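Good morning,

Attaching, inline, the C-alpha cells for the sequence recovery test we're adding to the shared suite. The designed sequence is right after.
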C-alpha cells in the first residue's frame, strides 16, 4: 500500500506515512499574482545548460525522469534568489487526464495542462542525498505547459515514451538539450518550499517561470499513454500525477519582474 495518485493512496493520504505533508513550507502553492511582491534585489537567473550531458530516461511508476551526469558542473543554475551553484540532476513533468488540469503550481487558481520540473542540487552539500536534508539543498525550476503549437525541443522526449511505457523501464537518452524546453523570458516567481512527492522534504527554493511553453495536443496525448503499472499488470494510465496547492502559511512569494 505505497503512495501514489489513485483514489486510495493519493495526496490526501500521504500525511499518514509522511507527516511533513502538513508542514510549514509545503509545495506546490497557488501564486496570487496581485500579492506577489516585486523584489528589485533578486538577481537575473543564470541557466547554464550548454554542457548538459543527458544519460537516460526512466519510468519510475509516478512520472518519467530524464537523468543527467551531475558528477561535475556541466549544467548549472545560479543567480536569481540562489547563493552558490546548483547542478542539474534530472527533469520530469506532472500532467493531467485533460488539458484543464495537470500543473502543481497554479496562477490565480489557474491550472495549466502540465508542469516541467528541472531539479538541481546545491554543490556545497556534495551529493543529492545530503542536499535534500538542507533548507537550501535544492532549486527547482518550474515551467508551465499549455496546449497549442508543438514544442519542437520536446519531440525527442515524446518519441522515446513508447519504449518506457511501464514502471521500471528505462532507455538510453544521450545528447538531449534541455535549453529546447525553455520559454523566451526567464521572468519568475520564487518562494521557499518542498518536494511535491514523498518524502515531501522542505529543501527546495522554487523558481517558477511566468511564461508557459506551448506543446501540441498530440505531444501531451503521448504523456497520457504512459502507465503507472509494471509490464504485464492491469493498465493504469499515467495521468493526474500532480499534487494540489498547499497552504502558503508564513511565506512570501517574490516576483523578479515589475
Ligand atoms: O516534484 B519534485 O519536487 O519536483 C522537483 C524536485 C523533485 C525531486 C525528486 C522527486 C520529485 C521532485
Ligand atoms: Zn515534480
Amino acid at each position: 500500500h505505497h503512495w501514489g495518485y489513485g483514489k486510495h493512496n493519493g495526496p490526501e493520504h500521504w500525511h499518514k506515512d509522511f507527516p511533513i505533508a502538513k508542514g510549514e513550507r509545503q509545495s506546490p502553492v497557488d501564486i496570487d499574482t496581485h500579492t506577489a511582491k516585486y523584489d528589485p534585489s533578486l538577481k537575473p537567473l543564470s541557466v547554464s545548460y550548454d554542457q548538459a550531458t543527458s544519460l537516460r530516461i526512466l519510468n519510475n511508476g509516478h512520472a518519467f525522469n530524464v537523468e543527467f551526469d551531475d558528477s561535475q558542473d556541466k549544467a548549472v543554475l545560479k543567480g536569481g534568489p540562489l547563493d552558490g551553484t546548483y547542478r542539474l540532476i534530472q527533469f520530469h513533468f506532472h500532467w493531467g487526464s485533460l488539458d484543464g488540469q495537470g500543473s502543481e503550481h497554479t496562477v490565480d487558481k489557474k491550472k495549466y495542462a502540465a508542469e516541467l520540473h528541472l531539479v538541481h542540487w546545491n554543490t556545497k552539500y556534495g551529493d543529492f542525498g545530503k542536499a535534500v536534508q538542507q533548507p537550501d539543498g535544492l532549486a527547482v525550476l518550474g515551467i508551465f505547459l499549455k496546449v497549442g503549437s508543438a514544442k519542437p525541443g520536446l519531440q525527442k522526449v515524446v518519441d522515446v515514451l513508447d519504449s518506457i511505457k511501464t514502471k521500471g523501464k528505462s532507455a538510453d537518452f544521450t545528447n538531449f538539450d534541455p535549453r529546447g524546453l525553455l520559454p523566451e523570458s526567464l521572468d519568475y516567481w520564487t518562494y521557499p518550499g518542498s518536494l511535491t512527492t514523498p518524502p515531501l522534504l522542505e529543501c527546495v527554493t522554487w523558481i517558477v517561470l511566468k511564461e508557459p511553453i506551448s506543446v501540441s495536443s498530440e505531444q501531451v496525448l503521448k504523456f497520457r499513454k504512459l502507465n503507472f503499472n509494471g509490464e504485464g499488470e492491469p493498465e493504469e494510465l499515467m495521468v493526474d500525477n500532480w499534487r494540489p496547492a498547499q497552504p502558503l502559511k508564513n511565506r512570501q512569494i517574490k516576483a523578479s519582474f515589475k
